[PDB]
Amino acid sequence: MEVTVPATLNVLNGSDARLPCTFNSCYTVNHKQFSLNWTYQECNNCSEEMFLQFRMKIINLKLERFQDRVEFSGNPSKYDVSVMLRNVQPEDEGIYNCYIMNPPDRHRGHGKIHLQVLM
Amino acid sequence: GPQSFVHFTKQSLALIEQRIAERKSKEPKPSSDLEAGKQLPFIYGDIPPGMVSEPLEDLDPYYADKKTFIVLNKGKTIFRFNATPALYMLSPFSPLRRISIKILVHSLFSMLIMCTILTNCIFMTMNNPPDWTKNVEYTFTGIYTFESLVKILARGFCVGEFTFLRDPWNWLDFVVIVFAYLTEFVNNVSALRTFRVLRALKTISVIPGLKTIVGALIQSVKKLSDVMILTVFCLSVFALIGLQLFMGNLKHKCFRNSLENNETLESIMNTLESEEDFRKYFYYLEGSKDALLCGFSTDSGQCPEGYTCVKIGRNPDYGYTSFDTFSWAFLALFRLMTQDYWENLYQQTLRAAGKTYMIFFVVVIFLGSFYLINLILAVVAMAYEEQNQANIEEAKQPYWIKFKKCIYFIVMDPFVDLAITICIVLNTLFMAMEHHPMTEEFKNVLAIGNLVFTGIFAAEMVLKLIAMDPYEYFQVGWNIFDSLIVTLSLVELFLLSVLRSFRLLRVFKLAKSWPTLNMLIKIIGNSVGALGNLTLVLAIIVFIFAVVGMQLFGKSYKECVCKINDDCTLPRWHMNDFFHSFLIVFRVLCGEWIETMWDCMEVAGQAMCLIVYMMVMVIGNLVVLNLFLALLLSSFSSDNLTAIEEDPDANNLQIAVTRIKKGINYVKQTLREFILKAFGKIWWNIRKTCYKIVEHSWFESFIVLMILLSSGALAFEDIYIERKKTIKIILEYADKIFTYIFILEMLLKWIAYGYKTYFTNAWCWLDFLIVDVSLVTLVANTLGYSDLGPIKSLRTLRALRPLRALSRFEGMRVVVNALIGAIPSIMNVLLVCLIFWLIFSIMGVNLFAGKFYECINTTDGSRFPASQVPNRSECFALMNVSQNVRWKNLKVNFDNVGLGYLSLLQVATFKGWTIIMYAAVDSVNVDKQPKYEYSLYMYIYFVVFIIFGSFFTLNLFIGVIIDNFNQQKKKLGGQDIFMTEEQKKYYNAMKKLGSKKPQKPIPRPGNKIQGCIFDLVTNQAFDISIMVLICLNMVTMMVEKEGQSQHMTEVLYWINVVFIILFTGECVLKLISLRHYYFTVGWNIFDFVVVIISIVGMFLADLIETYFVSPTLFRVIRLARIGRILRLVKGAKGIRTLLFALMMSLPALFNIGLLLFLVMFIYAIFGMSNFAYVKKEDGINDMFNFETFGNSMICLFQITTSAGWDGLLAPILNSKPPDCDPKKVHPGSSVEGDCGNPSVGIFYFVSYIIISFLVVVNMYIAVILENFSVATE
Amino acid sequence: GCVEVDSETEAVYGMTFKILCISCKRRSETNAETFTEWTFRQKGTEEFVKILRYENEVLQLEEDERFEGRVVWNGSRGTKDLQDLSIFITNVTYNHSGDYECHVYRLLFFENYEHNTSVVKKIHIEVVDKANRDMASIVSEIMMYVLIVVLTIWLVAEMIYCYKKIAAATETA
């Protein structure tokens, strides 16, 4: 599937950010089979940390580096898996990934967003 | 005159302006001979040297008033430019304007544009292009822009009347150019790339002669207006009937009787989403995507024990096969009319509703599918024939010579030609002996014989060339291709499996001696000769459709694959690449458009797929029909003049046979000479008495009644006869009595007519043979040898008893006489067909002999992947390990020439062709496991066959039979050959209703109020108001669907009640206005009956819906409303004539239907006797089989249209284990074994389809004759 | 095929009689595992006493003196999906006259579904010393002969009348 994400996302400090991640798959999304992996990495070659996942329902693992500031803001039924955020300090800057698997589709997708925190 | 070539100069322009002033002061047609795009008239002679391509003074005085000039191009083509300043900036006298003009007029410009267009048409076939395919597209856009600017500068944009934008083909070109650059500036990719396909249509503009025939097609379609209106109205009426009868019946399913966990039907329904869960609660047949249909009647499908029939779920075929809504009903009725996969809908509807509903399908098939198709076919022929007549009318308005002479005398003799002909026949016969399991000795014999034959042919090649040399040799058409073929054979001998089959084309040398094969060659030559432009337009249209389909749906076919194939891989028929898109388009042309469109819908949207498929079907069928009728009429009318003498120079074969007969006569005379030299009054009165008795009407009627009874008694021998123990014996003794009666009748026929007058009669011979068979069987049964092998098998010939009615019923006798008269030409055409098909059968044998085997898993019947078990040795090694593994072969294949003939028949009728094609394209080798589409481009073999041996051949047969029936009618002296003498006078009386003069207006009432009411009710405004009310009622009927709410039901009921009261009011008004004159008009009495029947139905449906409970009766009686919408015909002069033609044709169709019913009855009895116990697989079912007379008649009516005959034949081709069990025990009967008889099955199912084809062409003769009569007179 | 032919109801003393009990399933393509039980109520008795049971290709005969060594299976053989459940009497006596009952216990095997169904068929058998002829055969033969003779007489009468008229006309001419 094709995934449409912004390559660069500049968000002012002290403001709520939102990560647009959308994909197109011909098959109606089934909540009993959708597999989703939101991961964050400090860099391209850095380790990716999983912070939000959809196995049967939206489950947020509440990593300490994000506290409770991570909220789901999309809707898989309408193919929107975007993640919205609460106000920030510059440490949140990094790379965000949304891996998507929508069976019976064969291929697996990956959309990359390079979040940036402005002064 | 040659002097009239003056230039266009200052003085010329001044004269033009003076003439414009004269025309203004004055304030017709231009010279057709000087119309632009035509050749220069011969009066003007040769163009002077220096004046080619120069702006010349207008050559037509009609334009002397206006400012326009002429430029003449090499080839005498007249290009009419405009003298007004181009763009308002330039003028005819300009350095750039003249250059652009000459460039556009030149040929190299046209050749360059055509080359660019045809290269772009090759680059359009790449589904995904490489990245470098952008410089080429930039080059194409540059070339097109250069051409556009050249035309702009040559002839102005839009300044005057003779400009760029005047030509309609310029609107397409500019609309493309703008989109290309506009899109590049923008940079849905699919739509933008689809708009590029319009560049292909420029081929029609550039290639000479295609524009005129495209215009001809557009002019021909305009004649199909009345026919299309009638077709739409008839399909709408039948769709309303179907939507009323079968609303929601296809949602029937078998539901579990016992549930658990307090689960109800709705609770179960609102959870299941996948087929593996649906299969747990509904009955699915193994390997089926749709739940088994069931019905609530006694003659419907029966669910297993523990399953109950309920109406819930979705309709079959992804939900597209339904009668629930008017749109789906209309789609189903269009599918029925086109007879595309209609047997599946037939079977589904009968299983869901009941077998007594086959009457609906009979009426639809024999009133809409076979008649409305003939109106379209007849109208186009009349439209084409009128065009052709106008075209004809417009056209009317030292040592070398020693060997040379010797060899010439040796070879150029009649005997050698006959020897070569026999050699060709023997070589073809030798090639026809190939088959798959061929031993090495047989293979060596075949190779040696082929070498001998090719050596003989090469020898004669060299002999003839040395005899006359290659200057005189290469001047003969037959010689050219003979040399080509011998060269190819030599190449093959020196060197695959195709070049060996090119010697088969030598069979066409027999065309010289064979008049009716020259007709086939002439048809083929015309298709690429006179009508080559039409064939080219057909090719261009098919290419455009393939490209459009690919561009639109290729990406979807791949992305949404799991919606149409559970393996998530592309199905057999898709649009993902150009070859498969073209295959789908060709299949649609062949006539199969629903199976491949269901997947299209599922992947890429109903609106898009429907629009594309409807456009493809309509336009492609129009072009194919135009080509077919053009070839037919042109070829079969060109030779009518007898323009050349019959064999003026006798053919070498004719001379050889003449010499042979002369020699035979000489030998006979010599031998005869040598052998002769060496060595009663009472009897006559009795005969007269018997004549009197047997000629009596009472005797004839009694014997006819006995014939009917004895033929009907044959329908009681079902498999259930053992339950009817009294009927058994009653029928036995009735059979004995019938035998006695017919023996006495034959004896009286003898004693009356005489042993000569009786036995010189074919009808008497038939009756004698039937009674003799009956007597022999009776004697054998009485003597105790009833079960004696062939004697027992003779009992099966009692199915021929119905044949005794042909001589008794004049309606069938007349049609039988026509068929007997037409037989000879049918045999000639069949001979040519068999010879032509032998070539393709041999080629198919050489291509596919023994390569249809495969190793399958008998549980799911799935071919093993070739990664494992790649050959037969490994298949057997796997057999020894597992148990449910089989090395199977197709039952219809190309293993030898006979099975090749059967396969070619199935392909030409389009029934088993998919099953054969899949194996053909999968074939790898002999003893090798097939791989998926290993030989993908084998589809071309079947494409080329379906063209040559099923389109040109059908054209030839249709022409021959039409000419033969015309000759028969001429011999009778302009008498209808399908009507009996009594029906002739009724036909003549009916004819007068089409030419009645208008009657006097009804006199006004002599009463003050009645006169006003008459004046009001006799108005065109009143008629139009009633027509619009009928249309609104039709819309109200159409707005009804399945699952509608009770409020919708109530409002629709009240609307219909209001319409009923309005029509009753109109009836009352017309009554009080026209008094007793009212009932003198047939349409008015029809309105009266319709009104009364509507009221009665409305009042009676309440009783059927309030006290009695009979949904079937309620639905049947609610059909009385369609009588209200049938009144639309009265105000349609267009379709009334066509329905009158149908009414006039009915008398002839009755006889043909009677004969067809008799043939169907005979074949039904034979099928009951033979195929009652064969194994139930493929097309033989619990409901569609030969166990009973009704089931047999259902199957036979189905296959009368040639639908599913392969599926009915397949179960009968099992004759050995493990396919069938020869000693299976059937409870309740003594018959053993469920095996079929392959030879009897093949004979049965081939002969029946051939006979039905002959009867169907008889019906098209009758319909065409009546349509022509009604259109003319 | 499968046709439920009703059993005969007349056995001749001393010979062999086959009692028919055919039970066909609604859909022939389904799978099943059938077994049967027969019960017999002798004339003059009011109790149905089980006499035999057949399952898994083995006939288990009860210890009944009236049927000992006089019954053999005549049903479907070599399968567990029985549709013919007949039995054969190898030596018919007067104790074999009464109402029979053929119980069929069929167990369909569906997809994630098992249905245990049952049927009962009643056969009444009367034992006689001679085999009576069928009344339908009697009437059919008599009707055939009367119709044949009637047709012959009618044709002969018509021939005689027409010939006498022909001779009279010829003598007039």
Ligand SMILES: CC(C)CCC[C@@H](C)[C@H]1CC[C@H]2[C@@H]3CC=C4C[C@@H](OC(=O)CCC(=O)O)CC[C@]4(C)[C@H]3CC[C@]12C
């Ligand atoms: C090709 C072989 C292996 C299989 C078929 C046998 C052929 C040797 C036969 C089949 C039909 C025959 C043809 C059928 C009829 C004619 C027309 C005949 O012309 C006439 O003089 C007859 C006039 C007429 O009745 O039309 C000349 C021979 C020819 C071409 C025959 C040539 C020999 C043919 C091709």
Ligand SMILES: CC(C)CCC[C@@H](C)[C@H]1CC[C@H]2[C@@H]3CC=C4C[C@@H](OC(=O)CCC(=O)O)CC[C@]4(C)[C@H]3CC[C@]12C
């Ligand atoms: C005009 C007359 C003489 C022939 C009419 C039938 C043709 C359309 C047939 C005859 C031979 C056929 C060809 C024979 C062999 C092949 C190879 C076949 O591919 C393979 O066999 C697979 C090879 C591989 O993958 O290794 C693809 C189709 C093709 C070109 C066939 C295309 C269809 C052809 C031209």
Ligand SMILES: *[C@@H]1O[C@H](CO)[C@@H](O[C@@H]2O[C@H](CO)[C@@H](O)[C@H](O)[C@H]2NC(C)=O)[C@H](O)[C@H]1NC(C)=O
């Ligand atoms: C033939 O096909 C059948 C059915 O697909 C195979 O038998 C079972 O198939 C299922 C999958 O539908 C497997 O899960 C089972 O393990 C199979 N049963 C076995 C092996 O007993 C069967 O394997 C196939 N035949 C061969 C020779 O592989």
Ligand SMILES: *[C@@H]1O[C@H](CO)[C@@H](O[C@@H]2O[C@H](CO)[C@@H](O)[C@H](O)[C@H]2NC(C)=O)[C@H](O)[C@H]1NC(C)=O
């Ligand atoms: C199917 O039904 C039959 C008949 O009711 C069952 O057979 C009975 O089973 C019970 C025990 O569950 C016994 O006490 C009866 O004596 C049996 N009667 C007969 C005539 O056999 C049978 O158990 C059922 N089969 C299944 C698989 O449930």
Ligand SMILES: Nc1nc2ccc(OC(F)(F)F)cc2s1
């Ligand atoms: N060989 C063939 N037998 C038949 C019988 C009926 C038929 O109807 C159709 F509409 F297809 F022409 C076609 C054919 S082709």
Ligand SMILES: *[C@@H]1O[C@H](CO)[C@@H](O)[C@H](O)[C@H]1NC(C)=O
């Ligand atoms: C009825 O449904 C309840 C759950 O609502 C369940 O506990 C009970 O077993 C069910 N009874 C039956 C007979 O299905």
Ligand SMILES: *[C@@H]1O[C@H](CO)[C@@H](O)[C@H](O)[C@H]1NC(C)=O
């Ligand atoms: C076939 O199978 C049998 C039993 O498994 C085995 O004994 C025998 O050797 C096998 N034969 C062949 C030819 O593989």
Ligand SMILES: *[C@@H]1O[C@H](CO)[C@@H](O)[C@H](O)[C@H]1NC(C)=O
């Ligand atoms: C028949 O029944 C009688 C008792 O009514 C018994 O005495 C006799 O032995 C029986 N015969 C057989 C063969 O069972």
Ligand SMILES: *[C@@H]1O[C@H](CO)[C@@H](O)[C@H](O)[C@H]1NC(C)=O
């Ligand atoms: C039946 O049994 C009786 C008594 O044993 C015997 O007389 C008779 O022959 C037997 N009949 C047959 C057909 O075995």
